[PDB]
């Protein structure tokens, strides 16, 4: 230990690069500084990581408690805790699930107890169309018009996987209404405060995403017209299919990079499939020392 170096982007710019990180030997202070960087700079890019799937899980265990994805078709064949996004067949077989995350979302936002930290370890990186898009929803909250902050004050949002639940191999020949009903039973919509206070930073986070947030309700639980959600999606940059909105950050990476990011503050989205270049990434998702927000 005592060799890790963190290079934060200047000022309010998102992100930091982390050199000399070895998960097997990092000190307690090293991990504390890395976690502080994640919560403050939102994306930490670990450089020069050459890890097996088993070692990648070991690295995640240094940061928190891993949770495996609740649908197992996403899981790595050797490591249940690794979620695999892949469109490269292996021995002709589909590993993980292709073309995941083509919509704005925070990970597990449709679940009652979402984890605070997402780790992505790219395996196959497009030459041209690489990277992941991000919006910092605490910064996006701050940039809302004052009256729009007022309009969501005291409201609650409903989040559900019902739009982007992916058909599974064993769903073939089932009637679609059966699958729709099963999703509502297995993963019922969850209600969260529209905004919450980040336990680590104190920031107010606007916890919505176009992909999972399906309704908004007033302070008494009465459903509000979803045009409010559309206006919030619009203001925060989530309806811009050009990805030019000022809130949007394109995070690129190179071989050996490993992204660790704040899954309270950030929403993210895969790029458009503007090229046929494949993507393969391994994901570990960990709970840290606090719940997503104090109301959980
Ligand atoms: C529905 C998504 C997975 C996918 O894009 O197929 N869930 C990812 C997550 O919430 O962690
Ligand atoms: Cl794109
Ligand atoms: Fe995701």
Residue numbers in the entry: 28 to 323
Copy text from the publication.
As expected, Fe(II) is bound at the conserved 2-His-1-Asp facial triad motif. An acetate molecule from the crystallization buffer occupies the putative α-KG binding site. A conserved arginine (Arg310 in ScoE; Arg270 in TauD) coordinates the carboxylate moiety of CABA in ScoE and the sulfonate moiety of taurine in TauD. A comparison of the choline-bound and CABA-bound ScoE structures reveals a conformational change of Lys193 that positions the primary amine of the side chain to interact with CABA. The observed orientation of CABA in the ScoE active site appears to be maintained by electrostatic interactions with Lys193 and Arg310 on either end of the CABA substrate and by a hydrogen bond between Tyr96 and the CABA secondary amine in the middle of the CABA molecule. In all crystal structures lacking tartrate both reported here and previously, Arg157 and His299 are both flipped away from the ScoE active site and do not interact with one another. These outward facing positions are observed even when CABA is present, indicating that this conformational change is not induced by CABA binding.
With the discovery of ScoE, a mononuclear Fe(II) α-ketoglutarate-dependent dioxygenase from Streptomyces coeruleorubidus, a second route was identified. ScoE forms isonitrile from a glycine adduct, with both the nitrogen and carbon atoms coming from the same glycyl moiety. The stoichiometry of this enzymatic reaction is measured, and multiple high-resolution (1.45–1.96 Å resolution) crystal structures of Fe(II)-bound ScoE are presented, providing insight into the binding of substrate, (R)-3-((carboxylmethyl)amino)butanoic acid (CABA), cosubstrate α-ketoglutarate, and an Fe(IV)=O mimic oxovanadium.
